[PDB]
Design a protein around this ligand. Sequence first.
Ligand SMILES: *[B]([O])([O])[C]([C]N1[C]=C(C([O])=O)N=N1)[N]C(=O)[C]C1=[C][C]=[C]S1
Length: 358
Amino acid sequence: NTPKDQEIKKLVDQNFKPLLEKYDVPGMAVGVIQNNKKYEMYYGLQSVQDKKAVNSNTIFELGSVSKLFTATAGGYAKNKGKISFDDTPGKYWKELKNTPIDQVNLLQLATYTSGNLALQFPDEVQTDQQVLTFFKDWKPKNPIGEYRQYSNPSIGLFGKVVALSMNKPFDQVLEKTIFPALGLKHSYVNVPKTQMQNYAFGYNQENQPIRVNPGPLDAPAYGVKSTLPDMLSFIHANLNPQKYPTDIQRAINETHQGRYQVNTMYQALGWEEFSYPATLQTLLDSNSEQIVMKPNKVTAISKEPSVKMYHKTGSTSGFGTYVVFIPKENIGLVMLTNKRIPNEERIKAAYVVLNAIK
Ligand SMILES: *[B]([O])([O])[C]([C]N1[C]=C(C([O])=O)N=N1)[N]C(=O)[C]C1=[C][C]=[C]S1
């Protein structure tokens, strides 16, 4: 009657494959997981100049999807009693004790509500000392906890604090503790010399080959690299947290808890959450210029839905990512590209595929 894998391949070919020609994207990996079966589809080239095909070993930059690993590490720490989300940063980074930023709690930092932290650090902040000084010098603007402004520094600081609580630097937290707990084998903060042959180039808007630049608190905000099989395993863990040991199970479940809303989007830890079924437009609205780039007053959750879906977009200058999962249908999807394409196109292609399967 047509086997499931060919059916999924056809749906992906209908919806994702034409994006490659349309946006001149050299390579793409799309996976679906459904009831513990994994489907992997690969297209084009990880390196144009080397004529190297995209494949199950290709390492892609996840950009802001990296925030999901940061949130997971925070969930892991918290459920191990190493932090409380009501703590402030000065408890762990002692140089911030009794400074204005120490009036902001960990949860407000992870969910972008300090009320005065912008998308990026200033370009001049690079070293560990400059990051410290930035935070010591910080002062409040909007009332703490009431306005969401999506921010690398805000969740970067959370990440740093989480690492300090676990007595390891943040790259070691992911590479030694969190990745191995999720069973991931090819995910990295720092890609080692022996895997560089698998690290795709990203491609900028003139299709020039580029990779992410080092930056302040880059790892917790946008600095993870992974493969399609790994990303499918991560979606599998979010769909089936009960199959994992206690510590990481509780961590995953902690990332799913909604904390506030901005209209139809519930801000969980890392993940954005929606009432399921969700319309396409609700998912598109989560990624509008007004939500992503500007401050928005938040609202206490006044309807908690029974059934939810979760997504997150991510980009670096040279790469695009989108992950989405729906626990009720035990289904999820990952897209990786080595050229940014509009977030709208990622969300819609994924919407059509997930809704058509079966
Ligand atoms: B994440 O991917 O949501 C995050 C935020 N962001 C900024 C941009 C942009 O400047 O167009 N796209 N996504 N990503 C990053 O901060 C990593 C990047 C740095 C520069 C371009 S993407």
